């Protein structure tokens, strides 16, 4: 019904917009960041698991202020078999991050984005998050 290349292009557009939204929001409006995540979403922050909007919000409130700078980004559309009748995309990012009172560190992070349709409007939510430092051992 719809071409495959279209999914790739749309996924790219989605990722490049999302990076902007999420990271700008994380830097500027930490409070609102949590609302991007759906409730079912799971977050793995350096091996620490966070589930549910509430825990996500508290966890994000707990973290220091940030100023992310993104080196590289990549994205792929996801097979429908994994999420039947639901449009979804995978995004991976590598960059540098600077937390308050902590030295700057390079980071790798991946997101799973699912499109959610409501009769009035359609919006995308983060179905998963995994963040880790390149050098988390130190």
């Amino acid at each position: 019904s719809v071409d495959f290349k279209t999914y790739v292009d749309q996924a790219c557009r989605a990722a490049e917009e999302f990076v902007n939204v999420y990271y700008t929001t994380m830097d500027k409006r930490r409070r609102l960041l949590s609302r991007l995540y759906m409730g079912t979403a799971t977050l793995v922050w350096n091996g620490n698991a966070v589930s549910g909007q509430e825990s996500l919000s508290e966890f994000f409130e707990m973290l220091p202020s940030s100023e992310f700078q993104i080196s590289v980004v990549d994205c792929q559309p996801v097979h429908d078999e994994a999420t039947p009748s639901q449009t979804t995309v995978l995004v991976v990012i590598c960059g540098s991050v600077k937390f308050e009172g902590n030295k700057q560190r390079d980071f790798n992070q991946n997101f799973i984005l699912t499109a959610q349709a409501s009769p009035s409007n359609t919006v995308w939510k983060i179905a998963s998050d995994c963040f880790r430092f390149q050098d988390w051992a130190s």
Partner: protein, 346 residues
């Protein structure tokens, strides 16, 4: 003029005598008038830069812990010569400059860095110029917002507002598998996968990947220069840096055949499966996602002797015989960090 090295040891002794262990207070009030130095016929003038420098040096070397100092009745016209005091005596929280010849507040700008709880500027010519104590206190507070006491009189509370921003990062964990089932399953799967991947003939992977399986490769930007990453350089995909769509389509591999065909072209590898760090981003009835952080060494070409670090993301839909089938595959490759190189193999 300059003082003989022998005189400096004597002065040091005098300072040690004038120092008090219990209170951590070092007194240098009227140092020239000191009977010993006068008896040895040694003349030490503190307003002179040499003697002061010497004194500061002695303080730093001998006593770095001192919290209180007294420089009263030493007739210092200028305070820049001791401006180094911040480094020499960081712990210092109490200073007394009473009875000296300095007429202006400006002299303090050079002594601004150090923080004092208590200060004494009484008896100096500068105190006379100020009409009201409010001006005095404000003028001094600008230099030392922290000090509690001035001229033996406790002061109004210092002006500070604590936003109470956080600075502590969460405790890092090694690997998250959630339920043990996923640990066993995922680890087992990685053993098999990378056992086949390391073999040299990667077509064994075709049983792992789905028919419509997608795969892509990325590397951190190098601002070619024949860098170690230069082999992966031809294949890396970055949507931020590459805006052309028709290429973006192709740098992505749509079907298992093209995926493994592409994977066979990648150099031979040796992976520390033991050292691998696994995170399970999400789990659903329909799919399972996880990330693998590790390092690998290559076995072919000149570049082989180099060690690379990698982060690989996997999405998997369940398959027969408790096996999992990959739908999406993303590989991020960079040269490994020294700390990673050191702990490369056990």
């Amino acid at each position: 003029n300059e003082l003989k090295p022998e005189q400096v040891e004597q002065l040091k002794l005098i300072m040690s005598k004038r120092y008090d262990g219990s209170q951590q207070a070092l007194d240098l009030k009227g140092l020239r008038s000191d009977p010993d130095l006068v008896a040895q016929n040694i003349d030490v003038v503190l307003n002179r830069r040499s003697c002061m420098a010497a004194t500061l040096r002695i303080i730093e070397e001998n006593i770095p812990e001192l919290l209180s100092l007294n420089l009263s009745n030493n007739r210092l016209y200028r305070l820049d010569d001791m401006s180094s005091i911040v480094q020499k005596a960081p712990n210092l929280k109490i200073l007394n400059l009473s009875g000296n010849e300095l007429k202006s507040e400006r002299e303090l700008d050079k002594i601004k860095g150090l923080k004092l709880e208590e200060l004494w500027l009484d008896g100096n010519s500068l105190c006379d110029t100020f009409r009201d104590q409010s001006t005095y206190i404000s003028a001094i507070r600008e230099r030392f917002p922290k000090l509690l006491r001035l001229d033996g009189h406790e002061l109004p509370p210092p002006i500070a507002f604590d936003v109470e921003a956080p600075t502590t990062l969460p405790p890092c964990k090694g690997s998250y598998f959630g339920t043990e089932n996923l640990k066993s399953l995922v680890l087992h799967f990685l053993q098999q996968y990378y056992a086949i991947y390391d073999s040299g003939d990667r077509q064994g992977l075709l049983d792992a990947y789905h028919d419509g399986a997608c795969c892509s490769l990325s590397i951190p930007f190098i601002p070619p220069a024949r860098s170690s990453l230069a082999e992966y350089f031809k294949d890396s995909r970055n949507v931020k840096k590459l805006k052309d769509p028709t290429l973006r389509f192709r740098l992505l591999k749509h079907t298992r055949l093209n995926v493994v065909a592409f994977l066979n072209e990648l150099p031979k590898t040796q992976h520390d499966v033991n050292s691998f760090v696994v995170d399970i981003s999400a789990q659903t009835s329909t799919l399972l996602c996880f990330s693998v952080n590790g390092v690998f060494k290559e076995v072919d070409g000149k570049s082989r002797d180099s060690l690379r670090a990698f982060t690989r993301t996997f999405i998997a839909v369940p398959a027969s015989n408790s096996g999992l089938c990959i739908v999406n595959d993303e590989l991020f490759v960079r040269n490994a960090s020294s700390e990673e190189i050191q702990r490369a193999f056990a």
